[PDB]
Amino acid sequence: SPQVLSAIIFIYFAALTPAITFGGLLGDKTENMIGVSELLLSTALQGIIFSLLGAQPLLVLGFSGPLLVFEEAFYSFCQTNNLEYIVGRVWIGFWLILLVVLVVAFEGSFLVRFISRYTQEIFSFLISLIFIYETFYKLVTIFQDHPLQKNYDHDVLTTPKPQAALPNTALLSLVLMAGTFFLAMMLRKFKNSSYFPGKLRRIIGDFGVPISILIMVMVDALIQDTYTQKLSVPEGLSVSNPTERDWLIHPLGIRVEFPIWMMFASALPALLVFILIFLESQITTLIIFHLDLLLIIGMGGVGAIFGMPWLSATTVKEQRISGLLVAVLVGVSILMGPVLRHIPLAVLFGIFLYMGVTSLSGIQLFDRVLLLLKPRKYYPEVPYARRVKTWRMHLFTITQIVCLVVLWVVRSIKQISLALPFILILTVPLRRFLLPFIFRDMELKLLDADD
Amino acid sequence: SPQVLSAIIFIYFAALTPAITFGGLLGDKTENMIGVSELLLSTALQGIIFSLLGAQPLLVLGFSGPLLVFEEAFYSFCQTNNLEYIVGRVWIGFWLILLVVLVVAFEGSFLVRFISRYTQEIFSFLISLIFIYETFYKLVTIFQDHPLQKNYDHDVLTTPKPQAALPNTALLSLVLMAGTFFLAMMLRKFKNSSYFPGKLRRIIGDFGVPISILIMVMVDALIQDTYTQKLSVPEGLSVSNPTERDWLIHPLGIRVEFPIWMMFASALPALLVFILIFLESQITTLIIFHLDLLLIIGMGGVGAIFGMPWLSATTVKEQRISGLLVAVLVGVSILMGPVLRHIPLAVLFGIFLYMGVTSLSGIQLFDRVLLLLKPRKYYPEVPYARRVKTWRMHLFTITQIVCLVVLWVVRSIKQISLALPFILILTVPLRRFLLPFIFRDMELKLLDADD
């Protein structure tokens, strides 16, 4: 049917846009171990093996920011002490497996009843802040790798990586990253404009991210005499750096024996995986049970066997075939390596920043963070700003900002890390115990009352 | 008084912002003959010698876009046949002088009664289109002067001008031009926002252009190892390229005798100067007369004696001292050459584009040019869109677009030029004779009825 023909490409683009950029981000946050080929394959089988078994086969299992934060933190920790990033993570997966049985025997979704706005708008807000900060850290690395000079050197080999500073890169990349973001923002506003009649508009506006990558892929295509960093994509059905990893992974290590005292001490880096996948797994279920989430947990654990990052829930009869088709198309997408390698990394990072910005404006916390600076004579009329004293509003925002700073500090120091979720989850008692001691109940039902 | 102390700096910045950028534009549109030192001095004496004698001493005599268009057209024509740009223009000034007497004897401001919206919104709209097109022509010249490569050469001398292509310029300039414009737009929106209380906001917002040049002057200051094109400013009270021109100009030429058959055939390039200065001289007088304009005409003619471009009217008791002070400060401003030469040209061109954009949104013609593309179900409610048939509105815009294209073609071809004003003024009969034959009087009083 014509409806399906359009819907399947719509969902295909919506699901393919984040995967490639996250694969590139992982390719840079690690040496080259985890990239696009395995990640794009990670969600390929996952689609079908969730569509076959699932309460809601209309959902999409994409890759989310918090998971990436956890893996980059793990890589940072994995380098403080000599450890194999791939191999150790594998054991984490096995630990997840034994957590599956303990919840299959008896449900453990009680915490869903204790999750509120104070928690999911301080956590998501932090994610929208790590995305913006992440792209500004790359400019520093670029300016140090290719510093601005006027002499340079002749004929530097660059096939594996630029061996020395060369011109037209430190600030060409800046143009490329700042161009995609600008075009994406303009098309986002286009979708919410009055140019062109109705549907004939939103057909293109709804494809802003998929469309605002090709313009400046062509830009790099038309500029070939200047080198730019691009994606690291191996051949079809192949693992990037096949001399460093294989499809089948040996738990005892590939090159160096994995330390003995790590086999059974990997429980801690696994319950946190479970917590992160759990918290995000209910935000996307409020659009409208236990087995649906337990399958996701076990299947993410399975993904740790051959070396694929685990997936997480995302946004949204013939229900089965939709997931079937999206999964098979994603799987076949990895055969376009020769044309997929022309995409430069700065374009992906610009799309990443665009993701980090749009997700920020939808959070209701920011709408009052700005009001803090706003003078108290232009406040918008919302039924939580006229029934509450003005000098009490700013106090709540300060209570949230202090927690935000506390969370940020932990994410900054390299030594003490991998505990951001542990320090974040204990904010729920702060909301359930400390907050009811300072604010009145009839006032608190308007600041952090989730709908 | 404190009021004066703030007002004088306010007007000083408002009058100094356009002069520097126009001087740079002239420095590039000519070899180096006319630049900033003489132009910034051109309006220095002019301020006092108009404040002393003038009907409204509160006005400001700045440099406008159409005049610059005329001078660049004259330079283009001056190169088709071997002629001295400075010397020939001098004679034009003398011609303007004899036009002064003919109008002093009897007034000639009749055409003011025949100027309407159809004329000053098709002319100003074009000006806002050259400004945008002008800055996009420079990128082509830059990419041809410094093409993108990866080998380049070592140690190129650049003191008078870059003798060969060097890195970090073809697209650094792009960052610099696109940065000032973005910041200026953001601060323009800042002035129309609700951040910060009332006046404490608009004090900075009203200085958007003066403030959004220093940030990225500092950017170039912090990047000194990469060369960028900058202003050509000579020492204090000196003419740029003093081996090519002097303060006192000899009408028979400096290096080559000026052709004889040009002395008395320069009337045509002078009546057009008069027409351009006339048409703009009434748009700024409708905010609420002959000698006031005749003085401007004669004084612009005087400016052609020592080699300064003529000035034109612009936007807006102690009235005298304001002009006195603004003039003396402008005159003294030319002593800051050592610090004024650090400003790069791309910054000035970005400010030029900003000027070309803001002036575009204020024209009521554009507000319906966009409606042409708008579907006929979101039209704004203005008392000229509900009393007129929709299919008749687009016709008027087409009648204006065809004239716009006709005007653009003339400005494009190099051979046939210097006649844009001649072909534009005869649009007034088109408005007074052709238009009343196709549209009804009771319908025409809502499309081009000036207030």
Author numbering:
A (entry chain A), B (entry chain B): 420 to 707, 720 to 747, 775 to 909
From the paper:
Anion exchanger 1 (AE1, band 3) is a major membrane protein of red blood cells and plays a key role in acid-base homeostasis, urine acidification, red blood cell shape regulation, and removal of carbon dioxide during respiration. AE1, a member of the solute carrier ion transport family 4 (SLC4), mediates the exchange of HCO3− with Cl− across plasma membranes. Mammalian erythrocyte AE1 is a ~100 kD integral transmembrane glycoprotein consisting of an N-terminal cytoplasmic domain (CD, residues 1 to 360 in human AE1) and a C-terminal trans-membrane domain (TMD, residues 361 to 911 in human AE1). Here we present the cryoEM structures of full-length bovine AE1 with its TMD captured in both IF and OF conformations.
The classes without CD and fully connected CD are both monomers in IF state. Particles from these two classes were combined and refined using a soft mask of the TM region. The final reconstruction of the IF state was resolved at 4.4 Å. The IF state features an elongated TM11, which incorporates residues from intracellular loop 5 (IL5) between TMs 10 and 11, and partially unfolded TM10. In contrast, the core domain shows a remarkable difference between the OF human and bovine AE1 on one hand and the IF bovine AE1 on the other hand. This difference comes from rigid rotation of the core domain ~20° with respect to the gate domain followed by diagonal downward displacement of the core with <5 Å along the z axis and small lateral motion in the XY plane. Further inspection of the IF structure of bovine AE1 TMD reveals that, due to the rotation and downward motion of the core domain, the ion coordination site becomes open to the cytoplasm and fully closed to the extracellular side, i.e., it is in the IF open state not previously observed in AE1. IL5 between TM10 and TM11, which assumes an antiparallel β-hairpin conformation in the OF state, loses this β-hairpin structure and part of it folds into the elongated α-helix of TM11 in the IF state. The concerted movement of TMs 10 and 11 and the β-hairpin to α-helix transition of IL5 opens a large cavity at the intracellular side and exposes residues R748 and E699 (analogous to residues R730 and E681 in human AE1) to the intracellular solution. At the extracellular side, the downward movement and rotation of TMs 1 and 3 occludes the large permeation cavity seen in the OF state and shields the binding pocket residues I546, F550, E699, and T745-S749 at the previously identified central ion binding site S1 of AE127 from the extracellular solution. The IF conformation is stabilized by several salt bridges between the residues of TMs 1, 3, 5, and 13 (D447-K557, K448-E553, E491-R869), which aid further in the occlusion of the OF cavity.
